[PDB]
Amino acid sequence: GGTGVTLFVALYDYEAITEDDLSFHKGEKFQILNSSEGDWWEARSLTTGETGYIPSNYVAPVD
Structure with missing residues (x-):
């Protein structure tokens, strides 16, 4: 499947x-x-390259 590659x-x-x-x-x-560990995802910003946690309800799939 293609779950992890969704931006x-x-x-x-x-x-x-x-x-x-x-x-x-x-x-x-x-x-x-x-x-896999709750409401917060570890993420990489595609704008800045920084990695850290983000509140997952603030983001949505791109398309």
Whole structure:
């Protein structure tokens, strides 16, 4: 299957409060690195290259 290769885009801005979490703008895209451990996914920003956690309800599949 093709589950892991789905890319996601932020629907909303988010401002992180800890160094391990990513800040992002609406419209920025992500590769998801780990999504098996709750509401927060580990992700790679396709805009900045930074990796960290993001609140998964802020993002949606790109298409």
